Structure formats: structure tokens, C-alpha cells
Symmetry: C3
Subunit: 183 residues, 3 copies
Amino acid sequence: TRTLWTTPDTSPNCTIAQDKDSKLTLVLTKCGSQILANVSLIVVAGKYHIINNKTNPEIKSFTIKLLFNKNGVLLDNSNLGKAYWNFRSGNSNVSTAYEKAIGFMPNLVAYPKPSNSKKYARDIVYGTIYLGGKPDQPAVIKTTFNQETGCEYSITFDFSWSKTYENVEFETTSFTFSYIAQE
Amino acid sequence: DTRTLWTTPDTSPNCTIAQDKDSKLTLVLTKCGSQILANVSLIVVAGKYHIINNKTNPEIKSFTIKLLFNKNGVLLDNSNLGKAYWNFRSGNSNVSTAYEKAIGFMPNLVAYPKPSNSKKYARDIVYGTIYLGGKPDQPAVIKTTFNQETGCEYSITFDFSWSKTYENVEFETTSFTFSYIAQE
Amino acid sequence: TRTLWTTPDTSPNCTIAQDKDSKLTLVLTKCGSQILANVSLIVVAGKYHIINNKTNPEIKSFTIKLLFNKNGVLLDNSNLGKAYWNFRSGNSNVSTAYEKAIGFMPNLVAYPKPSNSKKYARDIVYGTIYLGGKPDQPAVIKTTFNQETGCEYSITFDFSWSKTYENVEFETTSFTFSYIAQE
Ligand SMILES: CC(=O)N[C@H]1[C@H]([C@H](O)[C@H](O)CO)O[C@@](OC[C@H]2O[C@@H](O)[C@H](O)[C@@H](O)[C@H]2O)(C(=O)O)C[C@@H]1O
Ligand SMILES: CC(=O)N[C@H]1[C@H]([C@H](O)[C@H](O)CO)O[C@@](O[C@@H]2[C@@H](O)[C@H](O)O[C@H](CO)[C@@H]2O)(C(=O)O)C[C@@H]1O
Ligand SMILES: CC(=O)N[C@H]1[C@H]([C@H](O)[C@H](O)CO)O[C@@](O[C@@H]2[C@@H](O)[C@H](O)O[C@H](CO)[C@@H]2O)(C(=O)O)C[C@@H]1O
Ligand SMILES: [Zn+2]
Ligand SMILES: [Zn+2]
Ligand SMILES: [Zn+2]
């Protein structure tokens, strides 16, 4: 079981603002002590489908959280739907929900849960993706590990942009990053 | 399969952008299961794109290098990259002849569909920035697109471009790493 | 044996300007002919701990060097301490110091040592990381392979920034890159 993923089709699997308003494509491949991750996002409807900052100046960011319990299982408060996340089988997923994926969780010593101790920035990775694949439409994808509550582990994607986009569909290029694995 | 498909890493020209063997593309593809970890750099040694001067030629701002593969993952002759040294790695060179299969290194067609009249999504593109001559003030964009060429089953296209006005700058780049979802 | 690392704790292991003034977290995971690297830096004391370019406009960069001999063993003149640079075991290291790691070394034909032959830029990788995890606090991390002398192989991290930061602690987000291995 070396890859946990959302199948790479275009069917909605994530709820940002309203039910199933987006397709998060996330592939986590275990390369031993590091997880190699590849991510992209297609928003298909709702509030974040077409960005028009002339009309809505305040719509400049949104968040997608993946919350996991002690066994690396996705919790239902996550934005990504549970039915859509599992180990890879061909171009699809296994038939039944996995029970353990601790080896794909962000390492708690590298990336500790919030506490009264000093918080370090190494639990964040920043990247830039491009809306519609156009070079002049960058948006930031900030990924943070284990900073959510109500979970043993978490991966949070905070998307934001600073440009004033007018009628730009929120569907992105892909970004790769890695993180240190719990086991 | 943790093998590596590569161009070998010396600097002998192995690619044709504007004229025969005018450049050396160094591309290393390593299979990490469902993802291919890729490392790429480029050295142009002659011809039109060797030395850039956007004051005399402001129109020269981009070029393309295409790798075309057949259904077996074999590089096709009409790719910009020459077939002679694109092969699986054996030490600092290649295995004795020519792989026949490398489908496991090809860009996934569900993730990155060939052109059609269905909506074209941006996820088949990865943008990166590399630097000419290793200088921090000489960025150029390397845009990599998967499976968008025709006359092939799979493809990897590198579109190089720059918006800075370069003056007699040699086009040889730093390296960029990206990954993509593997077909198998 | 597929991972050479600094361990993921925050105990200082690197000397930039003064003894153990920082924790360099570096994980090298061998993915065959390519090494997948993940790096971040936390400076805890000394000259590069708090950056203030109003006060010291001259402090705009520093370097961290890892020098290796023919066997891939870290030389003591590296900025990183030999103490906790070893193959991984859980969240720590193996008890005994390794004696060979040539397969983690940057390839000499791809990245040759300086000579009177033409020097090419492919032995460099540039990335951007963010101080304190703030998006408006970018710094460049430039990594160069095999350009140091007095070693068979080397990996050098050159950090620099161009913005005038005022009392910004140098602790970074993480960055991932890869390089061609010697064997
Ligand atoms: C693919 C990529 O790197 N996109 C860049 C983009 C392109 O370089 C540009 O659109 C190509 O012509 O530039 C972006 O920044 C614009 C910004 O760039 C600074 O260097 C410049 O000083 C500013 O005046 C301004 O041009 C863009 O938003 O278009 C960023 C994007 O990441
Ligand atoms: C390696 C890297 O990130 N290079 C940057 C480059 C360097 O940060 C900078 O040259 C180091 O001083 O900065 C580039 O953009 C520049 C801006 O940072 C600067 O404020 O204004 C410059 C124009 O006067 C320029 O836009 C650069 O030098 O081209 C971009 C490059 O990616
Ligand atoms: C995480 C990231 O990409 N950070 C960018 C940063 C952010 O996009 C921005 O601060 C929003 O948080 O933007 C940087 O570039 C700036 C431009 O976005 C801005 O328009 O002009 C600034 C100069 O006045 C600056 O060039 C930044 O804040 O430095 C670049 C950084 O990588
Ligand atoms: Zn629409
Ligand atoms: Zn030249
Ligand atoms: Zn501090």
C-alpha cells in the first residue's frame, strides 16, 4: 500500500462552501521516511467556482482540511469526503475503507500539535499554482501539518490570492511537495 | 520498479530545438510507485536559442522541447530529444540497447487526458522557475505539460519562456524537480 | 538505510556563525538514482537568529556546508555536526555512525567539481522559503552540489533575502527538491 489518493478523475469529492463543490486531487506516495505529495484543485460550483473580486472583493481565500485519527483514518469533519480517500488500485481505489495509514501521517515530532511550546514554521510548505494554467493567474497554496484540533494528525490546504481576478475559474495547475512521515 | 529513465548526465548535445544537436536536455525520471519524480535542466550550445539578446530580438522569448512516446513508452524519432541516449540507467550511462517498455514512467492519462473537446483542466501543467547561468536575477519559466501533443500516446512538453529582457545571455539552466502521476 | 537525516527534533545541530546556533532539519531519502531532499532551518541564537536589516543592512545571506569524503561520510569541517547525521531508526538515528553513503552523494558527472572545463548551472537548485511561516517574508534557499573543495562531494545551502526585514526570527518553512545520485 504505497499510495493514498483521491482518484484522479474530475468528480467532486470535497466541500468547501457547499456540498461537493470541488474536486481535490491529492496523491500521497510513501518514499520511506518521506511522503511525496502531488495536489491540484478544481472548484466546480458555488461561492469559489468563479472568482470575481470586482463583485466580491472579500473573497480571497478558503481552506480545505484533512483531519485524521490515531490510525491515520480521515475524520468526517474533513472537507474531503471519506468515500473518496483510500489506497490506489489501478486508476481507482480499493473497494473498502482502509483501517491504518500511520506511515502516511505527518510526523508529530517534526510537526507538533499546538501547545504552549514555541510553534515553528517547519510544519508549513508554501507553493504557487496557476488558475486555468495561465502564467499570470497565480494563487498560493499553503499546506500546514498537524495544526488542527479534534484530531491526532492533519493536513490543511489554505488557498489564497492577492491579485484582483475577474471571472476566473478556480481550477489549478499541480504542485508537488514532500513531508516527513510519522513512521 | 524504482528504476531510472534518463538522458545520461554528461553534456554532449542530445537535442534539437532550432537546429541539429543544438542543445543538451538533462532529464532524469525515477519511479516512486504511483508518482514519477522528475529532475530537469537544459544547456543550449548552438543556434538560435544559444545566446539570447532581447534588445536586438525582443520577439525571441520562448521555445519548446517535446518528448513523444508511443503506447509502450518508447521515445519517438520526431521528438526534439534524440533516441540514442534516452534509456534506463546503468551506472553513468544506459543499459545495452533500448527499453521496449516504460509505460510505468508515462504521465497518467486519466489525470492528464490527451486533447479532446472535453474541458481542458490545468492540472496537466506544472510550472517551475529555473535560472540562467545559475544567476538569481535571471529567471526563466519552465512549463511542463503532460499528454497534450498529438501523434503519440503520451508526451511531456517543456515550454521555456522568460519575461526579462536578456542581453547576450547563454541559455543554460539550473535544475528543477517536479513529479507527476504515473500511468501504471 | 534509505534515509540519511538529522532526526526531526529541534535540538541544535548546526553552526552557522557560532556553536550550535541552529537546527538544520535535512532528510535525504534515496529514491534510486535520485535523492529526494526535505530541508528547513531554525536559527536559535547568534548573528542570524533575529534579522534586522535596518540595524544591519549588510546581513543578507549565510551558508551551510555539508562536505563528504569518498565514502559519503560527513567531514568535521561541515557546518552540520556529525553527531546526529546518520541513517534513521524511528524518530532517531542508528546507534553507530555509518561508514558508507555513496549512494546519497550528488553525482559527479552531473555535478562536477570545479576545473578548467566549462562550468554549467545544473549543479544548482533555487527555492524560496518563508520566515516564521509568513507569506510576505520570503528568503531564497540556493543549493549547490559538489562545488566545495577539500572533499569528494558536497551539498551547500546558501540562504539569502532581499527584503529589509525588521526583527524577523530566521526559522523557515520547509522546502523539497531532488538531485541525481553518484550511484
Ligand atoms: C509562470 C510564472 O512564473 N508566473 C509569474 C508571472 C509571469 O512571470 C509573467 O506573467 C509572464 O509574463 O508573473 C507574476 O508576477 C507579476 C509581477 O512579476 C514581478 O516580477 C514584476 O516585478 C511585477 O511588476 C509583476 O509583473 C504574475 O502575477 O503575472 C507572478 C507569476 O507567478
Ligand atoms: C533565486 C530567486 O528567487 N531570484 C529572484 C530574484 C532575487 O530574489 C533577487 O534578484 C535577489 O536580489 O528577484 C527577482 O525579482 C527582483 C525583485 O526581487 C526586486 O525587488 O526587483 C527586481 C527588479 O529591480 C526583480 O524584479 C529578479 O532578480 O529577477 C526574481 C527572481 O525570481
Ligand atoms: C507565499 C507566497 O507566494 N508569498 C509571496 C507574497 C504573497 O503572495 C503576498 O504577500 C500575499 O500574502 O508576495 C510577494 O510578492 C509581493 C507581491 O505580491 C506584491 O504585490 O508586491 C510586493 C512588493 O510591494 C511583493 O512583491 C511578497 O510578499 O514578497 C512574494 C512572495 O513570494
Ligand atoms: Zn462554471
Ligand atoms: Zn554556450
Ligand atoms: Zn528564537
